[PDB]
Amino acid sequence: MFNLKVKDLNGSARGLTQAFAIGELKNQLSVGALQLPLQFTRTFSASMTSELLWEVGKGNIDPVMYARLFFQYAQAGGALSVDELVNQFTEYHQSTACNPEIWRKLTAYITGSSNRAIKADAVGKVPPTAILEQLRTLAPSEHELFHHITTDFVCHVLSPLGFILPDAAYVYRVGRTATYPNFYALVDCVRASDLRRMLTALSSVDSKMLQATFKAKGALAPALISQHLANAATTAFERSRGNFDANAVVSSVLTILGRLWSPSTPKELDPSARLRNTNGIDQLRSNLALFIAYQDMVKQRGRAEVIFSDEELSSTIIPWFIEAMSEVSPFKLRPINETTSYIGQTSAIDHMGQPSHVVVYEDWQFAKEITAFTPVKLANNSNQRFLDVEPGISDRMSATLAPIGNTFAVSAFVKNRTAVYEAVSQRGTVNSNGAEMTLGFPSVVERDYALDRDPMVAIAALRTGIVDESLEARASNDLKRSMFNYYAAVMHYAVAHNPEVVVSEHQGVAAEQGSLYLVWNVRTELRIPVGYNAIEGGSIRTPEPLEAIAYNKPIQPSEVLQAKVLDLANHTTSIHIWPWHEASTEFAYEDAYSVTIRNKRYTAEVKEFELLGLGQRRERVRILKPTVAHAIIQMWYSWFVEDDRTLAAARRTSRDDAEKLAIDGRRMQNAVTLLRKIEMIGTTGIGASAVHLAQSRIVDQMAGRGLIDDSSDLHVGINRHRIRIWAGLAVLQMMGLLSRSEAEALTKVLGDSNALGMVVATTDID
Amino acid sequence: QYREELELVEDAARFVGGMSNLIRLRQALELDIKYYGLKMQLNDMGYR
Amino acid sequence: MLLPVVARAAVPAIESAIAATPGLVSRIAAAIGSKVSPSAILAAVKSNPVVAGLTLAQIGSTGYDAYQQLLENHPEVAEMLKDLSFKADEIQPDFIGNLGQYREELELVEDAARFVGGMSNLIRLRQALELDIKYYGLKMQLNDMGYR
Amino acid sequence: MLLPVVARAAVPAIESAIAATPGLVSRIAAAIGSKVSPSAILAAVKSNPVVAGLTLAQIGSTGYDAYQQLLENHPEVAEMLKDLSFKADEIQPDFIGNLGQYREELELVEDAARFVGGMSNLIRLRQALELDIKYYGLKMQLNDMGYR
Amino acid sequence: QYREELELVEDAARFVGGMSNLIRLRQALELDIKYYGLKMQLNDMGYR
Amino acid sequence: MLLPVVARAAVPAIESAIAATPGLVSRIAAAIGSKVSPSAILAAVKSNPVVAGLTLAQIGSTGYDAYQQLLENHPEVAEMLKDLSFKADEIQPDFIGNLGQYREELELVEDAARFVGGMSNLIRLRQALELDIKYYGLKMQLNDMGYR
Amino acid sequence: PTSMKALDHTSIASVAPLERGSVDTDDRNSAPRRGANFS
């Protein structure tokens, strides 16, 4: 839940406004003053995937992914950039490959034989982690991630011969990918083209010949190995040498685009008639993801320069820049319509036409799986520890959570919201303000739980636009990188549904020599503007991507957004080296169901280990967090209390008979759909076993005092409908899904509406 | 004369929990105010 | 360099402090490590934000205002500013042992806390009981009138 | 009742304290709420362990020994006894605010801790650096002789 | 004359991390001992 | 919590040292960082074992006994306690160079060791040769009688 | 009795995590979180 006043966009949300992206902190942004027509038909979207555990120890090299490890190690690792990293990799690669000894000394170790041939039978086995231990001393580095890449190289040429133990295994987690390129994500993905051409040379060494000459002859010296490695590692050193600075490949090729978009480009520097006609610029001219990248470029550098020869050289840059991105990468070009598919919109209309509130939401497919691991140290004061997945705890919850899944789907939240604004609104126009725009982004709040951050700094990042410094850099680096996704994800949306876009050039405050911002042509067919613009001509031209949303008609999301859980189960043996205590929630719970029977109070305590079938309380196990599940429920809570608040706010000032009865018509109808939902959770596997026990602690507490039995014609039912409801919270409480505070207010809402009173009123006949 | 009185404790007991708890809870309230401030402050520093 | 918005307000604040007393001029020259001449440091302030911050730490009297506003102007200097400016807080000899006695006590509160709810609740509930008796009577009476 | 293993040591311990001074007899009679006569409380001690504990809290001089041994053979009373005997630790007016200044500081240690390892490691590593230089020479020399 | 010296810092820098870290780490060690005791004690009370 | 088995011996041991001289009370208050009052530190000892150990390091005269018994029932603190209590052993200026001369010599022993067997054997064999001659005669004579 | 002593002193092959953290969490016990009151 994030609310903004679309009339004053500057103040309410500056993160999503365009005025911020191109460097206007001050309120002013130019009108539709000067313009050039354009159509964006393509975009660069990250492939749809989220982090997965990948294991580095085994002999294979999968160049695409090791590349991905560099992204994470350097970028999110706190280091400067993957660019500086890769450079320090090829100084490292030059060190070993071009050096004749370092390939002898560690083939003396693995083969055992310094000066003489080794037979075919007498071939020992040396575990992979071994040779790594020594290579550390030979070719020392400050980045362990290099030693792993060389280690499993020699493992690859020696694997057929069998000089090494297969059994050992080891594991890391690759990171999540931003869906749209930040400026630097271009620079990175260009260097990562070098790197991928590096590794594809190492990876592809068969050494079949060395396998043939070993078999027939029966023996070979280290002089055959230690050359045949040194031939491989210097084939890779070729392929690294002589590639262009990514930093100056892109910096230019985003400028010479930026000059053929902007209408005002001085003729003194005009991209020439040849490069405008270059093969491929045509396509890159119409591409969006670059544009919002360009806007970033100038936001930071403030300027641009073309170092490369304006003609002869810059026409071999582009065909090299295209081949970098176009090739399979995290970023793959797609028709623009598709990348926004999951966003959806709905609005609350006045009688005339214009919006009162208008909601924008990300659809979701609720994640119905959950896993629970127990961490196991290798030795005292060693951080290697590797977890054991425990089934039978997890089978419970995932068969418990699967019933929850069906009933919370996001579309049913907004389908509910607009049903509120129908009832609460008066009959009269809204001139008073632009229609406020509420936007659910469960992805925002989601990222706060896995990163463990106060939801208030995340929101307040979008509002004011600046990130708080008080937090440590690991968060801000994933915060800003996030806050840029939403910005981008907005404009892909706005553009997708208003194909007419027009590129101006901002120069009012003369902040930068080159600047760009779109302005949309949307045809409103409305009388009065929301936001502020002159609404002249039967179409409005609005620089802000948000306003240009508001004038859309309802849109139904065509594609469910997909969360997917991190997978521990597959590799059990491999030792986890990534910290897993960030993604782990402790699992413990206590609660008491209190009821009053014939003027006394009977309280049944209950513990979580009982609920699960465990007989004893085991401390170690830790539930791996259900973020996306806690994301949605968090949304659905805040929109529920928000609704139920706004009504009881109108319900006081209604001053009508016909309308007032329509509010209480709504609340009651709301709260007993609330409850029939929670009662539906009570029948679940944890819900069951919570009930069966709670009644049983209450019985044996009444043993001492003989008192008369109930009718249970409806009493069994009345008591039953109550005990289930308390199961409904207990299951939500014990998993992370609902915090204890909001669980209380959610009782209080269901409490005063006397929902339960009305639920039973359908089970009697009069 | 204590018939009236003990029945009052056992009403308070059942609510809280075992008698041991109520003896604790009673102290928590009787406890000086500053301590509530102290604990709030450690949570302000991010300890739990 | 230095952004102009910071400059219109920031430059005169320092200059004022200099004109107030010379004794500060020598101090800032030592801390920032700049030429002792008042014209020199004023040339440095404009050049780097990080430098601008350390100066405003040296003079807190008149200068505190701009300093905070500088936080807004540059995220980076403040981020690398918190480290460069630091002083070890003198610890009292008694303190750590004196804290050892409250181990027994705080664990008592947190037993009471969990029961009630968030710490905020318990602070309320404590007052409700400490509250005068008449109020319980008052509330009962409003319910007697059919108000609730 | 009271287990003999305890009672054997407990009874004469109390009786000794009584014979030492009468002033305690009146105190324990007040705390336990028992008849002031020394024969009465001694009859109560045998009857209930909880009572036996409160007595041994009133006299800590000679009595501390048995008390611990009582605590061993009775883990049951341990919880209950801990509650009945309690005193609010007087808090210093300066304390909570005085702690507020270390917020900046402790967060600095925990940044250094995580990097190195467990807190135990960092305490070691700190010493290794603070350590005299010659030792680095010494260790280098043993490696020169081929010792490891 | 500082050629010898700065190259020494940058060896220490790369190891630790960004220069900002090393400036911190340097303070952590220079810091008084009691603080190490203090932090250990909060962990003794079960505060993280 | 300090285990009773220890605490039984520990508490009076400390209290005895306090009663012996006041000069220690101020010392332990400094090291542990606790309130100087003898009642305070005694309240701290009971609370934490780690604290209890540091106290027993400050007083080694009468206290060494309990300390070891503390160490038994608590292998946990053993690591942590060993670190918190440490003193750099003063090294002699001559030492490391003085060791350099024995490089030639020790390598000679280890040549003799490997030949004979474990170092234990060589220490024996050395004595056998150094041993008086008559014994060789004695043993020969028992074999002359038939004894083996 | 058999002696496993010699085999006991060992080191584990070291490695460095990509993203440091989660270090002091090796041994801790968080005591349970209560549910809300009910009515």
Helices (H), chain C: 4-20, 23-28, 38-47, 49-58, 64-73, 75-79, 81-84, 95-100, 103-116, 119-130, 134-144
The experimental method behind these coordinates is cryo-EM
Residue of A496, A500, A536 whose CA lies nearest to A518: A500
Task: State phi, psi for E43 to the nearest 5 degrees.
Answer: -75, -25
Chain A residues closer than 8 Å to E17 by CB? 78-79
3-state secondary structure of A594: strand
Rounded Cα distance between A580 and A173, Å, is 10
Q: What is the b/e burial string over A566-589, where b = at least 16 CB atoms within 10 angstroms of the residue's CB? A: bebeebeebbbbbbbbebbbbbbb
Question: D-contacting residues of A 459-488, CB under 8 Å?
Answer: 472
| Nearest residue of B to residue C99, measured between CA atoms | B38
Residue of C52, C48, C51 whose CA lies nearest to C13: C52
Neighbours of C131 (CB within 10 A): 10
| Nearest residue of A to residue G31, measured between CA atoms | A588
Rounded Cα distance between B30 and D136, Å, is 59
CA distances from A423 to A429, A651, B34 (A): 15, 11, 49
Give how far A539 is from chain G: nearest CA, Å.
51
Chain breaks in chain D following residues, C–N > 2.5 Å? none
Query: Is F36–C94 a contact, with Cβ atoms under 8 angstroms apart?
Result: yes
Q: What is the CA radius of gyration of chain F?
A: 27
As given in the structure block, the two tokens for residue A295 are: 């806007």
Task: State phi, psi for A275 to the nearest 5 degrees.
Answer: -70, -25
Burial class (CB in 10 A: 0-12, 13-18, 19+), D119: buried
Rounded Cα distance between A345 and A498, Å, is 14
Burial class (CB in 10 A: 0-12, 13-18, 19+), A660: middle
Residue C109 carries which DSSP code? H
* All residues at 6 or more sequence positions from D42 whose CB lies less than 8 Å from its CB, including other chains: D11, D14, D15, D18
C33 contact G CB<8A: no
Residue of A184, A338, A331 whose CA lies nearest to A246: A184
* All residues at 6 or more sequence positions from A368 whose CB lies less than 8 Å from its CB, including other chains: A398, A401, A402, A404, A405
Give how far C114 is from chain G: nearest CA, Å.
6
Query: Is A469–C117 a contact, with Cβ atoms under 8 angstroms apart?
Result: no
Query: Is D117–G23 a contact, with Cβ atoms under 8 angstroms apart?
Result: yes
Asked if A198 and A239 touch (Cβ cutoff 8 Å), the reply is yes
Give how far E34 is from chain G: nearest CA, Å.
19
Burial class (CB in 10 A: 0-12, 13-18, 19+), A368: middle
As given in the structure block, the two tokens for residue A519 are: 């302005």
Neighbours of A599 (CB within 10 A): 5
* All residues at 6 or more sequence positions from A290 whose CB lies less than 8 Å from its CB, including other chains: A44, A181, A186, A254, A257, A284
Q: Which of E25, E40, E43 sits opposite D112 (nearest CB)?
A: E25
Question: How many distinct helices (H) and strands (E) make up chain B?
Answer: 3, 0
End-to-end CA distance of chain D: 63
Q: Which helix (H) or strand (E) holds A591?
A: strand A589-596
Rounded Cα distance between B18 and B10, Å, is 10
3-state secondary structure of A539: coil
List chains touching E (3+ CB pairs under 8 A). A, B, C, D, F, G
Rounded Cα distance between C32 and A160, Å, is 63
3-state secondary structure of A343: strand
Residue G33 carries which DSSP code? E
Query: Is A744–G37 a contact, with Cβ atoms under 8 angstroms apart?
Result: yes
- What angle in degrees, to the nearest 10, is found between the helix axes of A144-158 and A63-70? 170
Bridge partners (DSSP) of residue C53 are none
A452 contact B CB<8A: no
* Chains G, D in contact, 3 or more Cβ pairs below 8 Å: yes
Q: Which helix (H) or strand (E) holds A649?
A: helix A627-653
Residue F96, amino acid: I
User: Residue F85, Cα to own-chain centre: how many angstroms?
Assistant: 14
> In which order are the strands placed within the sheet that holds A601-607?
A601-607, A589-596, G33-34
Phi/psi class of residue A361: alpha, beta or left (left: φ > 0; alpha: ψ in -120 to 50)? beta
Burial class (CB in 10 A: 0-12, 13-18, 19+), A308: buried
**Alpha-carbon dihedral angle through residues F98, F99, F103, F108, given to the nearest 10 degrees:** 100
Q: Domain count of chain A? A: 1
End-to-end CA distance of chain G: 64
Chain E residues closer than 8 Å to G31 by CB? 46
Query: Is C117–A740 a contact, with Cβ atoms under 8 angstroms apart?
Result: yes
Query: Is D96–B24 a contact, with Cβ atoms under 8 angstroms apart?
Result: no
* All residues at 6 or more sequence positions from C68 whose CB lies less than 8 Å from its CB, including other chains: none
| Nearest residue of A to residue D108, measured between CA atoms | A472
β-strands A436-440, A3-4 pairing: antiparallel
Helices (H), A327-429: 336-339, 394-407, 411-424
Chain breaks in chain F following residues, C–N > 2.5 Å? none
As given in the structure block, the two tokens for residue C57 are: 């730490």
Resolution stated for this PDB structure, in Å = 4.0
3-state secondary structure of C76: helix
Asked if C109 and C85 touch (Cβ cutoff 8 Å), the reply is no
**Alpha-carbon dihedral angle through residues A407, A410, A415, A420, given to the nearest 10 degrees:** 90
Bridge partners (DSSP) of residue A357 are A348, A436
- Max distance between CA atoms of chain C, in angstroms, equals 81
Query: Is E40–F50 a contact, with Cβ atoms under 8 angstroms apart?
Result: yes
Chain D residues closer than 8 Å to G24 by CB? 110, 113-114, 118-119
**Alpha-carbon dihedral angle through residues D53, D58, D61, D66, given to the nearest 10 degrees:** -10
Tokens 């981008």, residue located: A488
Rounded Cα distance between G36 and G15, Å, is 44
Rounded Cα distance between F34 and F41, Å, is 6
Task: State phi, psi for A385 to the nearest 5 degrees.
Answer: -50, 140
Rounded Cα distance between B16 and C89, Å, is 43
Rounded Cα distance between A208 and A157, Å, is 9
Task: State phi, psi for A236 to the nearest 5 degrees.
Answer: -70, -35
Tokens 């081929």, residue located: D146
Residue of A34, A40, A509, A39 whose CA lies nearest to A263: A34
As given in the structure block, the two tokens for residue D76 are: 């049951």
CA distances from A308 to A245, A276, A301, A318 (A): 11, 16, 18, 11
Tokens 């309802």, residue located: A554
Rounded Cα distance between D59 and F126, Å, is 66
Give how far E40 is from chain G: nearest CA, Å.
11
Asked if A74 and A80 touch (Cβ cutoff 8 Å), the reply is yes
Query: Is G24–D115 a contact, with Cβ atoms under 8 angstroms apart?
Result: no
Rounded Cα distance between D133 and A725, Å, is 70
Domain ranges, residue A615: 1-766
Write out the residues of chain D at the interface with chain A, using a CB-CB cutoff of 8 A: 111, 117-118, 120-121
As given in the structure block, the two tokens for residue A516 are: 């760009």
Residue of A359, A265, A285, A280 whose CA lies nearest to A324: A280
Q: Which of F30, F34, F47 sits opposite C98 (nearest CB)?
A: F34
Residue C33 carries which DSSP code? I
β-strands A501-504, A37-38 pairing: antiparallel
Rounded Cα distance between F144 and F138, Å, is 10
Rounded Cα distance between F54 and F85, Å, is 7
As given in the structure block, the two tokens for residue D113 are: 């801790």
* All residues at 6 or more sequence positions from G8 whose CB lies less than 8 Å from its CB, including other chains: none
Asked if A486 and A15 touch (Cβ cutoff 8 Å), the reply is yes
Rounded Cα distance between E29 and D122, Å, is 9
Residue D33 carries which DSSP code? I
A754 contact G CB<8A: no
CA distances from E15 to A91, D107, D108, E11 (A): 17, 21, 18, 7
Chain breaks in chain G following residues, C–N > 2.5 Å? none
G36 contact A CB<8A: yes
Rounded Cα distance between A353 and A429, Å, is 10
Residue of F1, F14, A329 whose CA lies nearest to D71: F1
Neighbours of A396 (CB within 10 A): 20
Task: State phi, psi for A709 to the nearest 5 degrees.
Answer: -75, 150
Chain G residues closer than 8 Å to E48 by CB? 24-25, 28
Give how far D101 is from chain B: nearest CA, Å.
10
Chain E residues closer than 8 Å to F76 by CB? none
- What angle in degrees, to the nearest 10, is found between the helix axes of A144-158 and A128-138? 130
3-state secondary structure of A43: strand
Rounded Cα distance between D121 and D106, Å, is 17
Residue of A473, A483, A414, A478 whose CA lies nearest to A449: A478
| Nearest residue of D to residue C108, measured between CA atoms | D83
Residue of A621, A489, A475, A628 whose CA lies nearest to A51: A628
Asked if A348 and A355 touch (Cβ cutoff 8 Å), the reply is yes
| Nearest residue of D to residue F100, measured between CA atoms | D141
Query: Testing the interface with C: which of E32, E33, E39, E48 to mutate, by most C Cβ within 10 A?
Result: E32
As given in the structure block, the two tokens for residue C5 are: 């918005």
Give how far D38 is from chain B: nearest CA, Å.
27
Query: Testing the interface with F: which of D62, D68, D121 to mutate, by most F Cβ within 10 A?
Result: D68
Asked if A56 and A153 touch (Cβ cutoff 8 Å), the reply is no
Q: What is the b/e burial string over D46-66, where b = at least 16 CB atoms within 10 angstroms of the residue's CB? A: eeebebbbbbbebbeeebbbb
DSSP labels, A149-177: HHHHHHHHHHTTTT-S-S---EEEE----
Rounded Cα distance between A359 and A6, Å, is 12
Give how far G2 is from chain A: nearest CA, Å.
22
Rounded Cα distance between A735 and D69, Å, is 43
Query: Is B39–C110 a contact, with Cβ atoms under 8 angstroms apart?
Result: yes
Side-chain-side CA neighbours of F8 within 13 Å: the count stands at: 14
Tokens 């194909």, residue located: A499
DSSP labels, A51-63: --EE---SS---H
3-state secondary structure of A520: strand
Bridge partners (DSSP) of residue A438 are A3, A359
